Design a protein around this ligand. Structure first.
Ligand SMILES: [Zn+2]
Length: 262
């Protein structure tokens, strides 16, 4: 199969006698296919930056193995030559420490896997606006990607209500470097939605949040590009194209429903 860098796919496997799914000694979790009881699903994501050229996954069964080849596609993201190259920044030492501390926190949060659906059917858009700057716009040096937009931006006047794109559990709700005021929601199955640059946070860590429920107010009045909501999705351990992920997720789960029981 084929996958564009920085996107996720939902891999389908036979359920009977399946034991584990691996990528070079990394284990990939599985979950039920909601519409075919004989199938299970797994989420595989390619990183946007410096991805492998090909990927071989092995599904181990009780008495056989199945190989799955994924070729990485470059896609057709918007890209611009970064003319300095130098791209090494020197934050003051106090900023460096805060960035490192928030990175260790985020890394641990994203690897704490929830093995059940916290979501409620389809994802909805977190506000009924439009994209102003989409995922994956890249800045290249000679021709390796130096940086890229790791989420998608919606137009929003400062103070616009922002709603949970799906049900789940709030894992982050605080001011972080780069992301500003941010909310991160665990939806289960290693899927997290991200809401950055907020002007107001209206939830607490560990709160159960319903789809369409208010999580804060849009902000970023003073950003490099002015007020907007930055929306992100992390799935399969990587930032992925969020609208492309939502489209793929909804095709599978949109006829399902769940209200929190725990
Ligand atoms: Zn953004």
């Amino acid at each position: 199969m084929e996958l564009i860098k920085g996107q996720a796919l939902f891999l389908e496997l036979d359920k009977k006698d399946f034991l584990s799914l691996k990528n070079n000694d990394k284990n990939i979790p599985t979950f039920a296919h909601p519409k075919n009881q004989e199938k299970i699903l797994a989420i595989f994501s390619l990183p946007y930056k410096n991805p492998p050229q090909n990927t071989k996954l092995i599904a181990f069964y009780k008495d056989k193995k199945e190989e799955i080849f994924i070729k990485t596609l470059e896609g057709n993201y918007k890209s611009e030559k970064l003319q300095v190259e130098n791209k090494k920044i020197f934050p003051p030492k106090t900023i460096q420490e805060r960035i490192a501390k928030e990175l260790k926190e985020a890394n641990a949060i994203y690897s704490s896997y929830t093995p059940k659906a916290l979501f409620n059917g389809a994802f909805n858009i977190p506000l009924n606006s439009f994209i102003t700057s989409d995922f994956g716009k890249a800045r290249t040096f000679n021709e390796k990607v130096a940086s890229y937009h790791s989420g998608t931006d919606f137009r929003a006047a400062t103070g616009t209500p922002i709603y949970a794109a799906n049900s789940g559990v709030v894992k982050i709700a605080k001011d972080r470097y780069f992301a500003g005021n941010s909310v991160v929601i665990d939806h289960g199955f290693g899927i997290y939605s991200q809401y950055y640059a907020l002007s107001k946070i209206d939830v607490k860590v560990g709160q159960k949040i319903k789809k369409g429920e208010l999580i804060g107010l849009s902000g970023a009045s003073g950003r490099v590009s002015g007020p907007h909501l930055h929306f992100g999705i992390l799935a399969g351990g990587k930032q992925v194209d969020p609208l492309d992920f939502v489209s793929k997720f909804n095709a599978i789960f949109q006829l399902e429903h769940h209200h929190h029981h725990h």
